[PDB]
Design a protein around this nucleic acid. Structure first.
Lengths: 38, 209, 174, 122
RNA sequence: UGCUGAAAGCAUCUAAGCACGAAACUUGCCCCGAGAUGAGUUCUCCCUGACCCUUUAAGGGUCCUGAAGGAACGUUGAAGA
RNA sequence: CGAUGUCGGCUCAUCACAUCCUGGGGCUGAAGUAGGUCCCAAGGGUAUGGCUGUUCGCCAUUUAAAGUGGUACGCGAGCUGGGUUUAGAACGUCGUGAGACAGUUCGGUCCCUAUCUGCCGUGGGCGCUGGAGAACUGAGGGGGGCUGCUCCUAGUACGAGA
RNA sequence: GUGAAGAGGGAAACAACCCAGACCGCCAGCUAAGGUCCCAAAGUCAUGGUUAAGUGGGAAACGAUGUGGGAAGGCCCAGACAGCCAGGAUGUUGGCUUAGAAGCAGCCAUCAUUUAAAGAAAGCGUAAUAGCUCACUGGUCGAGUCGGCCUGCGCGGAAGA
């Protein structure tokens, strides 16, 4: 996944979750857009 | 299970018939008579206390003699203790013989190694000697540097330096037991066990099995 | 919220039993027991269970919604039973079963034996299919999760243990 | 106990009369080579019509060592002079068509079975 | 990396809850280790006398007995400056 | 500035992680073998020579890998003394000259018996509540923790085939 | 202005910062800065909110359905938002470059019908096709909803011997 200081929604079906104090992005269509730690 | 206490008597070699010569250490494992059984009631842990050999009648002090003749044994050289892993019973006074290793396949031996005395760092810690020619001045087998500079300003604890080498308890682990001879009370292990010939060896079944 | 403002209509031989916070439910399929959170009040007024937030606790609605959802899954599991299907897509992959061990042959070098929990049982109508039938959704979900985790679906040939209705997308091999 | 800068005699007839070991292959910080051990050599003296020329870098296997080999009964076999058979660099097969002098039974594995087939004593 | 799962009627590895997960962490292996002043535990052995003084106090003194055991001395050690 | 001995080598190290190898994962323009990139991870390991005073570098041949830094660019009351940096001499250049040169070249005294802290070992005294002989539990502390190659599965999975 | 040439109390320690200028004595009291759970004197004081980060007790651009407040807006029981079943059509495959770009490589058109309504088109993939969908359209469902703005405190960014 992509570690960044900025997590955004690139796709349409990506949603922003907050797990264990980390904001992260999960996409249901494309797995490239999974990203973390913004 | 438990271990047995024997005496190292030399090294020999066994010529097997196929050709391979197995270099063995001979351990005369005599009869170990149980002297005290420590249990959960008095002691909070379970263990047995054994003895082997026999001391002279007058070398045994009164506290040792009363401890021995409290329960049915004659005085031997030294007392030892094995920690009884959960479900074994040895009655007080019981002589334990050497067929316990006629069961087992591998053995670890504990002994006091031979004392080299005050050894330098080259013998003790495998330090590399400095260059024995090329101008060197009174500094061939000296340790070298022992610390950095002003920021530690001190030698760190556990620094490898010259000191007493040997004469310490060491355990050699997972030796192949070659032959258990009950008729002469001989136990033969494959390899070199610690200690000079005559020192006492604690012989246990191998735990890294 | 809109979840917690909807009662669980409990039918036909319910056996609802509350002690303090804990609820134990027996039915025809089996018995399940939930240790509930402090924030939920359960109500068996008028033969049907409702769920309410507690005074003082902040997130009463989230705890009430998860309590209503878990109790609904609990009663529908002890009533009708949860059935999860898995398929072994792949050449050579077999799924023999004996007793309560599942003997997966996922072709590594050694066989795979998976132990099963108490209520869950696995029946194999094909050598490349598993159907596991049980009381709790959590237990059958974790068993299906471990069985899929033995060999997850490859994105090229689709080989592996797979949820029978989950669609895997294929990519081209360069 | 062949190390770096050891001069070895040459058992086969690739042409080298006398070579020098430049690295004991296999493993990091390795010191010595026994009879079952591959080394890298370079050639110092060659025959004028031979296959290999002086100043080449290739590989050899030791076949005789003055330190010897110790058989499992405890017996040692100490040859007089260290000797090697020159192998190819990446083929790892001998470059000779014959082999001089005796070799050791602890060399007997497949490629060096092809070596000891030419050997007059094992 | 998941399972169930609301807040957010869905979705969601997390908020309630649960299971995985590395040579790192705590143990398991080996050694020192009760000066661990918190100075531990167990087993055994050893001593079972008279009287004085003064501010009669965990007192001082006299005579007799020296116990287990230790130390010294010697012969010494694959123990050792 | 009533003195804090400096580059390199040797001996001995020790810590940080911004990880070289090994270990665990996500994405791949990831079929496989092999890569790339990023996250977690400091337990252990982390070449030998030629040249040069050299560190560095280039090269040769390896290795699982030949990590990046801190420690007075760690370490001279631990060793060396090649460079550099005294006095001799010479070259080129600058100067009328004495002399000068981050320009070379040859040669050229490296002192100290450890008081205190620190560390490695090793004892004496007293304590542990009458004295003594042994055997232990174990608070705690330390050591150790590396890895290749070949074979089997299987020449199967994958792949047009290699 | 203080130190130099100035002690005392505070900032853990800390000339130069804050309070305050030591003639000597006192086993007296009120205060300043700073504080009042324990070390360590004095509030585990009272009332009303915030914070979940050990923030408080180190750090920016930027990121985020973290949370508390304030003001207005878009749609909504002539039924909204999120789910769940159907539709997504014709002149018509839109006019061509192009083997087909049969709505998604490029220039022009982006207009006219059936009807509860459907863009001559927005992501993907295929020689073009196909197809999932997205706009949008009715039934169900039963009420709030989804966005911006200004603000208080938090969160990540945030790795060294």
């Amino acid at each position: 996944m992509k570690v960044r200081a900025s997590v955004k929604k690139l796709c349409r079906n990506c949603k922003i979750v907050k797990r264990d104090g980390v904001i992260r992005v999960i996409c249901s269509a494309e797995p490239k857009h999974k990203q973390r730690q913004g | 299970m438990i271990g047995l206490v024997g005496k190292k008597v030399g090294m020999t070699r066994i010529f097997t018939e196929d050709g391979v010569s197995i270099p063995v250490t001979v351990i005369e494992v005599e009869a170990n008579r149980v002297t005290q059984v420590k249990d959960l009631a008095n002691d909070g842990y379970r263990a047995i206390q054994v003895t082997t050999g026999a001391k002279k009648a007058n070398r045994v002090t009164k506290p040792e003699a009363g401890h021995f003749a409290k329960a049915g044994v004659e005085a031997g050289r030294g007392l030892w203790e094995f920690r009884l892993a959960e479900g074994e019973e040895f009655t007080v006074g019981q002589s334990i013989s050497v067929e316990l290793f006629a069961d087992v396949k591998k053995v670890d031996v504990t002994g006091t190694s031979k004392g080299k005395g005050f050894a330098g760092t080259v013998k003790r810690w495998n330090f590399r000697t400095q260059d024995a020619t090329h101008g060197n001045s009174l500094s061939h087998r000296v340790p070298g540097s022992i610390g950095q500079n002003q920021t530690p300003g001190k030698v760190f604890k556990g620094k490898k330096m010259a000191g007493q080498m040997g004469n310490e308890r060491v355990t050699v682990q997972s030796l192949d037991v070659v032959r258990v001879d009950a008729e002469r009370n001989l136990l033969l292990v494959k390899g070199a066990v610690p200690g000079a010939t005559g020192s006492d060896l604690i012989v246990k079944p191998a735990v890294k099995a | 919220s809109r979840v917690a403002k909807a009662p669980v209509v409990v039918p036909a031989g319910v056996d609802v039993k509350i002690n303090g916070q804990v609820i134990t439910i027996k039915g025809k399929n089996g018995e399940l027991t939930r240790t509930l959170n402090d924030a939920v009040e359960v109500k068996h007024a008028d033969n049907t269970l409702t769920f309410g937030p507690r005074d003082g606790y902040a997130d009463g609605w989230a705890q009430a919604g998860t309590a209503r959802a878990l109790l609904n899954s609990m009663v529908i599991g002890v009533t009708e039973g949860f059935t999860k299907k898995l398929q072994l897509v792949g050449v050579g992959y077999r799924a023999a079963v004996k007793g309560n061990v599942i003997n997966l042959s996922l072709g590594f070098s050694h066989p795979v034996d998976h132990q099963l929990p108490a209520g869950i049982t696995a029946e194999c109508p094909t050598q490349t299919e598993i159907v596991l039938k049980g009381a709790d959704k959590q237990v059958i979900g974790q068993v299906a999760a471990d069985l899929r985790a033995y060999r997850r679906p490859e994105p090229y040939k689709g080989k592996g243990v797979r949820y029978a209705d989950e669609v895997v997308r294929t990519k081209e091999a360069k | 106990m062949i190390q770096e800068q050891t001069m070895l005699n040459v058992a086969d007839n690739s042409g080298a009369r006398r070579v020098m070991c430049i690295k004991v292959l296999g493993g990091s910080h390795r010191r010595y080579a026994g009879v079952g051990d591959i080394i890298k050599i370079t050639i110092k003296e060659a025959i004028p019509r031979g296959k290999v020329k002086k100043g080449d870098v290739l590989k050899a296997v030791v076949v005789r060592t003055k330190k010897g080999v110790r058989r499992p009964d405890g017996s040692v076999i100490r040859f007089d002079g260290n000797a090697c058979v020159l192998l190819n660099n990446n083929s790892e097969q001998p470059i000779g068509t014959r082999i001089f002098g005796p070799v050791t039974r602890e060399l007997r594995s497949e490629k060096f079975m092809k070596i000891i087939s030419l050997a007059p004593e094992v």
